[PDB]
């Protein structure tokens, strides 16, 4: 149903059976990156404090750097200088350990995702990847693109000045929908000094159940939109007459 | 030849003997005393520099810094007892977090 | 005038391919001066209680055994005894 192939095909826009109208994306790209950051002056290394054994696996074997590590509790993935080395399990954005996902049609609100098999809590699913904007280009491209009559706006604000576009290039995390009963969410992990956005689960999702995440609600124009889920307390519209960003 | 070559030491003996008469300790310093005290000072200096060199090799460095001296002194049972009331400049503290604060 | 070249001579024997900064050299200078003042002051105190007019290797050894901890003082007494034995023989 996903069927990632590099040849462009005869599906116009809906991207449900043929994914090669737009382009896909790996780890994100930058435009005006300068060497002013906390990268390699104080966050040179943040090494965990672990005294492992690493010679006894599959029999009396605890997995290395579990939920007792100093870095997993503080939402930081380890570097290559780990005492476990190539046996540490924190490095999930670098070894690309993902979850089994699939994109088919569920409701007429749009496209989304449903879980293939069972998937426990606090389990990584997908990384949000896109194109990183800056100060000036955002308020020009939003008014250049609002007059193009698009439904889906793929904007996520990383910080107070960084907004990531996942429209021209996007991974499989661009189809995930909104509901007032969230079972997945977003977290802010710091890998290699840079901040990255991920998707974790919260409960024991059955095989064949929905996987959506809660939006922090936002309007930018005069119009309003509404949600079609209706779990138990679906507001649908926004939080009134707010105008923040 | 010097007396440091006779005793086999590296710290000088005449400077220690001069500081013993000069600093008003007794109407008389003895003798074997500057050799004995130079041996004690050389042993303590070599112990501090050995632990500082180990703490410097543990962080992939080739120059001993006051942080390496701080870690070498505070990560030892008896040097912390000998130097408990001493503040080292640009030394910092030992990284530790109490177990009732971690989630 | 200080103990800097002697600290270099001691450092090049226990770790050959290493260096040391000037701040660490000043800290080692202060350490050597502090331990010198402590041992000399305690040996000056020990020579007054017995009404003697001197200071001797026995006085320095008694000031070492009172001041240093258990495992450190034994090696210090052994090194000083070996050094004062090699001075006359």
């Amino acid at each position: 149903d996903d069927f990632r192939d590099p040849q462009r095909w005869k599906e116009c826009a809906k991207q449900g059976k043929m994914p090669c109208y737009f382009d896909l994306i790996e780890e994100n790209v930058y435009l005006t990156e300068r060497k002013k950051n906390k990268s390699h002056r104080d966050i040179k290394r943040m090494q965990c404090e672990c005294t492992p054994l690493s010679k006894d696996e599959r029999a009396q074997g605890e997995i290395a750097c579990g939920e007792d590590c100093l870095n997993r509790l503080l939402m930081i993935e380890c570097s290559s200088r780990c005492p476990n080395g190539d046996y540490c399990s924190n490095r999930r954005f670098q070894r690309k350990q993902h979850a089994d996902v699939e994109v088919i049609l569920t409701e007429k609100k749009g496209w989304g995702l449903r879980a293939a098999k069972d998937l426990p809590s606090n389990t990584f699913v997908l990384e949000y990847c896109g194109e990183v904007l800056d100060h000036k280009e955002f308020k020009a491209r939003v008014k250049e693109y609002a007059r193009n009559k698009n439904i889906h706006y793929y904007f996520m604000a990383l910080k107070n000045d960084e907004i990531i576009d996942a429209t021209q290039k996007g991974n499989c995390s661009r189809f995930m929908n909104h509901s007032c009963e969230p079972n997945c969410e977003t977290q802010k992990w710091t890998v290699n000094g840079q901040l990255r956005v991920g998707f974790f689960t919260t409960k024991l999702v059955p095989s064949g159940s929905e996987l959506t995440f809660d939006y922090q609600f936002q309007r930018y124009g005069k119009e309003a939109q509404k949600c079609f889920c209706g779990s138990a307390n679906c507001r649908g519209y926004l939080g009134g007459e707010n105008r923040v960003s | 030849k010097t007396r440091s070559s006779r005793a086999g030491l590296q710290f000088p003996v005449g400077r220690v003997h001069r500081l013993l008469r000069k600093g008003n300790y007794s109407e008389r310093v003895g003798a074997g005393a500057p050799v004995y005290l130079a041996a004690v000072l050389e042993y303590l200096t070599a112990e501090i520099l050995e632990l500082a060199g180990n703490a410097a090799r543990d962080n992939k460095k080739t120059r001993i810094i006051p942080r390496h001296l701080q870690l070498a002194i505070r990560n030892d049972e008896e040097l912390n007892k000998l130097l408990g009331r001493v503040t080292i400049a640009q030394g910092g503290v030992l990284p530790n977090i109490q177990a009732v604060l971690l989630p | 005038e200080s103990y800097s070249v002697y600290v270099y001579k001691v450092l090049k024997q226990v770790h050959p391919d290493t260096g040391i900064s000037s701040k660490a050299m000043g800290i080692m200078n202060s350490f050597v001066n502090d331990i010198f003042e402590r041992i000399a002051g305690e040996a000056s105190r020990l020579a007054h209680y017995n009404k003697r007019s001197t200071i001797t290797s026995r006085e320095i050894q008694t000031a070492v055994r009172l001041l240093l901890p258990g495992e450190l003082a034994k090696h210090a007494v052994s090194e000083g005894t070996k050094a004062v034995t090699k001075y006359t023989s």
Binding site: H40, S79 | - | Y8
Partner: peptide, 18 residues
Amino acid sequence: AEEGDSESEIEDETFNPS
């Protein structure tokens, strides 16, 4: 393959015997 900022060491120079 990776190294720290040299400024860390610059703030405390090595002792000069001369």
